[PDB]
């Protein structure tokens with residue numbers, strides 16, 4: 001008894017607060033922009049990494065209403081941190097960074113709205 005909508009307020013939140021909150025983070029630098037796997041010297045990054053994901057690509061999918069619901073934006077956020085876990089063994093600064101961005105991103109989603 002309900003037609004699916006593009007859940008824009010959670011996605012809004014994920015864009016407005018989360019995205020920007022992450023974006024601005026001490027640890028957001030490799031996520032704001034997409035890693036040049038040549039730049040950080042990552043010969044197997046686009047090899048190992050499932051789908052190298054950045055707050056940029058994510059801010060894209062959010063503000064371009066590509067996301068149908070926040071959880072995809074979240075899973076891209078999770079993806080973002082998980083690629084960092086995928087490549088960099090858990091305990092690497094970038095994972096640790098992602099890990100601090102997780103508790104920050106997930107901070108927001110811990111407070112993620114529900115559509116009226």
Ligand SMILES: COc1cc(C)cc2c(=O)cc[nH]c12
Nearest residue numbers: 030035040042045087088094
């Ligand atoms: C963009 O996030 C990163 C990914 C990888 C694979 C390595 C590093 C790194 O060696 C230092 C900072 N960030 C990294």
